Ligand binder design. Structure first.
Ligand SMILES: *C/C=C(C)/C=C/C=C(C)/C=C/C1=C(C)CCCC1(C)C
Ligand SMILES: *C/C=C(C)/C=C/C=C(C)/C=C/C1=C(C)CCCC1(C)C
Lengths: 262, 265
């Protein structure tokens, strides 16, 4: 409950509050933009690759609704105070919770992991085990990382152990994902492999922003510059930077591969 | 292995009346979506800011429903070729009507939005907003996904048709149970006029959403399939789907603004 500590203790200034709102807003705006693209490029690809576009489409709705709800929740959860000149947390149900983002990833991560297996062929690996290990590891990554965030402020020590258990589940993801890229690369045109490598480095970078934002409150030391409203701002841009990269750009690039393969 | 509309269009064919009635009801469909879009943009100012998230969601539902119902109308016109020997329309050139993908893509997109938006209007006393949303999404998505999968076996494998269709009804009965809770809970504490509208919303939700399995699963469940395995059944199902979409999207969103307008006073 990092945002609710800052939101109630220090408060949010007008710039910070309206930035998180605006960033989240264009976040769900580009989600619907990416959805428009994936529907249009469904007959651009062969029937074999149309499962990937649907997975992109399904991912687009869920990210939009998440970014949509979190944008609405952010607008309503913090009420302006006239005497102090800041926005403070207030009472209701349906308050802004960054853990809702986690539960979204619980289902979005496997889809984003699966849909490349529908684009990319597996050589010297069976589709079942790869997909099956993707599922358990990514799910195991998110659930324990979900747990650690509960101790983001009250217990930094549990925040450490739980958040570290998941980052090896992360390292599992990258260790199963690399061969998917590798084995699927050779055999198809080299330009599609170059795309696929860009898809890998993009994969690498964007998926580090999610533990990187998980480390925003305690980056400039435990309670430094980022244990403030700017650390709350910084976290929500980062997520929005990651979400476009991890989903829209990632799916757009998986389609180019599917288009190149006809 | 074959869609109901594909089999009829490839084997039996379509006489002029049936062929033009499907396009007619499809064009009427997106016309109602475009007209509903006018209402929602025009009413966005009639509610307090906290309820414009629901109105804009309706706008989003209208745009995508309009666009996707539009492509279906265009595809229906372009996918069939007239045969002068039979006086009928036959799907040609390996046109599969996209396996009704645009129809199911439309449902895949709109269903979560339709379920999500009522939480932006209605206030909850006992339930966890995030968990309701997650369940809504899981059930709604699985329903349409399993509906699209089983739709390929309606003419071929009755066993596979039943196993996927029965799975879609699991998700469906779960949605009904959820939507009933949200509405019954959101009635507490609000003016009785919005309570009455919320009940009309429930009844409308119940009936309209029921029309989709009615046109797909209930013909086989009652043994009336076979009488509809023709061009008549293709038209009857499309008309039912279109009436259901107007009710579940446009009429649904209108009543939501009426609740938000009462609570915005
Ligand atoms: C569309 C959403 C995406 C791709 C989410 C990705 C999630 C992760 C790579 C983040 C996992 C975490 C860690 C590696 C460290 C501990 C906490 C987490 C869950 C943020
Ligand atoms: C606006 C889009 C809507 C409301 C469409 C929703 C679809 C359903 C409520 C129906 C789903 C189905 C079943 C319950 C059983 C058989 C398979 C379906 C997809 C027709």
């Amino acid at each position: 409950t990092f945002e609710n500590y800052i939101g109630l203790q220090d408060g949010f200034n007008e710039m910070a509050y309206q930035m998180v709102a605006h960033v989240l807003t264009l976040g769900y705006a580009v989600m619907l933009a990416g959805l428009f693209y994936f529907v249009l490029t469904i007959k651009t690809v062969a029937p074999r690759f149309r499962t990937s576009s649907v997975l992109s489409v399904v991912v687009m709705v869920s990210a939009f609704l998440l970014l949509y709800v979190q944008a609405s929740n952010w607008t309503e959860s913090f009420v302006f105070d006239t005497e102090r000149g800041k926005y403070f947390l207030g009472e209701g149900n349906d308050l802004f919770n960054n853990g809702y983002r986690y539960l979204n990833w619980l289902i979005d991560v496997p889809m984003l992991l699966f849909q490349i297996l529908f684009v990319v062929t597996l050589t010297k690996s069976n589709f079942s085990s790869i997909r099956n290990q993707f599922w358990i590891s990514g799910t195991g990554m998110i659930v324990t990382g979900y747990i650690g965030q509960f101790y983001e402020v009250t217990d930094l020590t549990m925040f450490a152990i739980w958040g570290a258990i998941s980052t090896v589940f992360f390292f599992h993801i990258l260790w199963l994902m690399k061969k998917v890229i590798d084995e699927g690369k050779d055999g198809i045109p080299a330009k599609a492999q170059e795309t696929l490598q860009s898809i890998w480095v993009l994969f690498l970078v964007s998926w580090m922003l999610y533990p990187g934002a998980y480390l925003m409150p305690h980056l400039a030391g435990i309670e430094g510059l980022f244990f403030s409203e700017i650390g709350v701002v910084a976290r929500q841009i980062t997520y929005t930077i990651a979400d476009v990269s991890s989903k829209v750009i990632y799916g757009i690039l998986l389609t180019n591969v599917a288009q190149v393969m006809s």
